[PDB]
Structure 1
Amino acid sequence: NKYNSEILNNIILNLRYKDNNLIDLSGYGAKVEVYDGVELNDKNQFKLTSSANSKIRVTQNQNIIFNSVFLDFSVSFWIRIPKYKNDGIQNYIHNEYTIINCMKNNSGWKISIRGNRIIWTLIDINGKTKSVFFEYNIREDISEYINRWFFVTITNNLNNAKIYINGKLESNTDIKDIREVIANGEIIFKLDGDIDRTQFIWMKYFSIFNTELSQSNIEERYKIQSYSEYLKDFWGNPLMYNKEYYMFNAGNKNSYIKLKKDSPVGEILTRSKYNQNSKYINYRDLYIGEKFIIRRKSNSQSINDDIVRKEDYIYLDFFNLNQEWRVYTYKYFKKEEEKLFLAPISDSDEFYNTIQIKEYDEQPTYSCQLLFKKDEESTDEIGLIGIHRFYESGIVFEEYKDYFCISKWYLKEVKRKPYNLKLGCNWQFIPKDEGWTE
């Protein structure tokens, strides 16, 4: 409809990937210099490292007779900040480093990071300062932010500086007392401060607007830049085939899958937690439970790797001590839910092995759903993969226990609006990542 141009309104700088480089497609033609230390890929993601040559310099229109200033302006971008090093806590919490700086005659703005806090700073013509920040908890079991791509938007008008995270307002600072801010300085993208040589930042879709973006407009941009045909992993990157993944359940965040001893089923256990005793941090381990791997079903030709897309037909396997086993459901079960069947790769006609990976959520998410159908062409849906607490009435036992299950119930629950985010049928895949050490 070319009606999707709405999120381009008032844009004055739009950094985009093009021919192994970054260029401003705003139409105002800013000069962009990307140095050799900046890693760039087609997916619009760029990485800033500790290297001196890891920087980006953007030059804007020069102001000859008068000073160029902003009244209302906004800054948009996605970012992924790696988790702190357990052995480098002090440096993480105390050393602030600039990631992006835009100033001329000591006036302008900048974005800096101090540990788990992202900071927006304004400096007027007098040197007067004002800051608004977003800090995410580092003592939480499962963080929605640490080492995961998330959307940032900072808007400014003459009275308030607001920080929006993932389309929602998180912080606000009264800036009425701050004066004019020089806006045409060079914009330097580069890590600057006393940082660990291993520190890095990933950023994507950096843009500036010469207006105060509305929440409504920010939400739409959030939705549009979150949209993709491929599914994503726990970190927000594209989901792939033939890649080792630990499985996470949105509905039961502190649980993981473990092949139950002496059984062909997966039991659900509680995640181990940070063992040391730092008073600053806490988290549940993520690299635990069975190591799963997604294999392409339909047309399996020399599968070495690749991207998983919505509606793809797959095989959900996992390694049982070097051997690659598979996840199945019995073609027959009468309970509302039953235990999934874990076993070697076979063609048995006693159970279903084909899964279709879906996305029932209409809003941005990194979760997906796993559905077993009679077959690819059939519309008879068997059930969705999830977690359910069964009742093990032993002759003396009398105990309830969580199992990796399939459920007929979910099939109707995923239909309810708004889409249920708390469902135990929402999964996320976690691959080892340099940004997360435990």
Structure 2
Amino acid sequence: NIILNLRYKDNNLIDLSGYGAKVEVYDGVELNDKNQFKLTSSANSKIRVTQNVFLDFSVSFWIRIPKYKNDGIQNYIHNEYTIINCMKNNSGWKISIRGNRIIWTLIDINGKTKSVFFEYNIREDISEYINRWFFVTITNNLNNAKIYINGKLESNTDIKDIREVIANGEIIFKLDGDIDRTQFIWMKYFSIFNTELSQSNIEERYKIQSYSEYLKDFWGNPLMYNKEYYMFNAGNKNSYIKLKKDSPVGEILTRSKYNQNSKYINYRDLYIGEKFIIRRKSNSINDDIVRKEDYIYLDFFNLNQEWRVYTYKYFKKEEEKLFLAPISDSDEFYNTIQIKEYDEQPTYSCQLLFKKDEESTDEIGLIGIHRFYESGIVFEEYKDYFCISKWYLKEVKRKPYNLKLGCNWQFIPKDEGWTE
């Protein structure tokens, strides 16, 4: 039921539908072999698709929309811009964005218009949508326009009043509107179908196009070795790891927040805590992507020295503080971590299992966060620390898998799409 299927092949985009649409990718479009493409604000950043009665039809694609600039928030909220336009004789459809809102507009032959949209929150401590790959699907039948986000129905618009909408027009991928120079958009897997896709089908496609042998970072891009990452905890979203002053352990602190006074904006800072870096058991090499079940060392930088995250071999309680220390071999600690992804649903979270070596059947425990007793004349009697725990060994077997377990981590690199 596919009538257009844009995919990457050899530094270009082509139609694989077999209906042979002509695709002109202009020099302003950045492409990669992960099928991601980038529309920027410069004039040559566009794609023209020339394709060879009331018709049901559906569009799906992935999109990654960058965070607002804090100092440019008014126009982000105010200014709508088209990113994909498909019109003939002033009739057709368009996909637009006005700030934190993505919009689907239908235009009949008479110019009569209807829209359906999805809006995400820009006051969330930590957002699931901002500058993160998510999945979009819009369906149209005789009576309704629907938007699905990540397989789930989000909005519905009655389009009974509309009239014949012309669909054969050329499709223009280009940012069009009163935008800032720094504005851009990433897209992936653009598709069009000659039927209204059912919620069941969208969900299956969501899961299938979510599949990868590799792991992903917090933004949704492939997880990499030898790349600097801040760490996020899905069970403790506002917390972060810092090497404790004068002690070789990771204390856990609360993220700082947006500290100015725009009334449209709130978020927690993401670029804080230690800069971690994932290495290889053996060991630095070109574009090495991290895969499920890989064996790694979890390292980080401490004043131009590379330190590593250890566990004591012989910890006595159900959980214990991790040891953060220089790279060294020791009879007393494990350093071998196996990176895991226990969730069976789409996710960017992973788990970090300590192990004896690469051949062992023994599971020592999973890295997470726990509260420990503070001795002496202190403020608080308990404090959060960067830990290993045997308890998660039990909890990761429960089904369905818990998205919010404190043994679920994501890795956050600096990214042009998030500034704070």
Q: Fold match, TM over 0.5?
A: yes
Shift of 1:391: 2.6
The Cα offsets for residues 126-179 of structure 1, whole Å up to 9 and x where unpaired, read as: 111000000100011000000000000001111111100000111111111111
Of 201-210 and 305-314, deviating more is: 305-314
Contact 1:68/1:183 (CA < 8 Å) preserved in 2?
no
1:168 aligns with 2:152: yes
The answer for the alignment partner of 2:20 in structure 1 is 29
Aligned to 1:110: 94
Aligned residues: 420
Q: Per-residue deviation at 1:389? A: 1.6
Asked if 1:182 is matched to 2:166, the reply is: yes
Task: Specify every segment of 5 or more residues in structure 2 that has no aligned partner in the other structure, as ranges.
Answer: none
What's the CA shift string for 1:183-218, capped at 9, x where partnerless?
100000000001101110000000000111011100
Deviation at 1:298, TM superposition (A): 3.5
Deviations 1:288-313 (A, max 9, x none): 001101111136xx435511111111
Shift of 1:69: 5.0
SS in 2 for 1:366: coil
The structure-2 alpha-carbon separation of the partners of 1:68 and 1:431, relative to structure 1 and needing over 3 Å to count, comes to: closer
Q: Which residue of 1 aligns with 2:227?
A: 243
Matched, 1:122 2:106: yes
TM-score, normalized by length of structure 2?
0.98
Work out whether residues 234 and 349 of structure 2, in 8 Å CA contact, stay in contact via their aligned partners in 1: yes
CA distance in 2, matches of 1:126, 1:149: 36
Three-state SS of the structure 1 residue aligned to 2:200 is: helix
What's the CA shift string for 1:307-330, capped at 9, x where partnerless? 111111111011112211100000
User: For residues 319 and 257 of structure 1, what CA distance do their matches in structure 2 show?
Assistant: 13
Aligned CA distance change for structure 1 residues 368 and 396 (closer, same or farther; 3 Å): closer
Q: How far is 1:395 from its partner?
A: 6.7
- In 1, are the aligned partners of 2:19 and 2:52 still within 8 Å (CA)? no
**C-alpha spacing 1:22/1:265, structure 2 compared with 1 (3 Å):** same
Native 8 Å contact 1:157 1:212 kept in 2: yes
1: CA distance between counterparts of 2:417 and 2:54? 36
Shift of 1:396: 7.0
* TM-score where L is the length of structure 1: 0.94
Give the 3 Å change call, closer, same or farther, for CA 259–206 of structure 1 in structure 2: same
Equivalent pair of 2:107/2:114 in contact (CA under 8 Å): yes
2:420 is the alignment partner of 1:429: no
CA-to-aligned-CA distance 1:64-83 (integer Å, 9 cap, x gap): xxx99552110000000000
Aligned CA distance change for structure 1 residues 182 and 68 (closer, same or farther; 3 Å): farther
Deviation string, structure 1 residues 107-128 (Cα, Å, up to 9, x no partner): 1100000000000000011111
SS of residue paired to 1:346 = coil
Q: 1:393 offset after TM fit, Å?
A: 4.6
Change (3 A) 1:292 1:124: same
| Unaligned stretches of 5+ residues in structure 1 | 1-9, 60-66
| Residues 1:305 and 1:53: Cα distance change in structure 2 (over 3 Å) | closer
Deviation at 1:273, TM superposition (A): 0.2
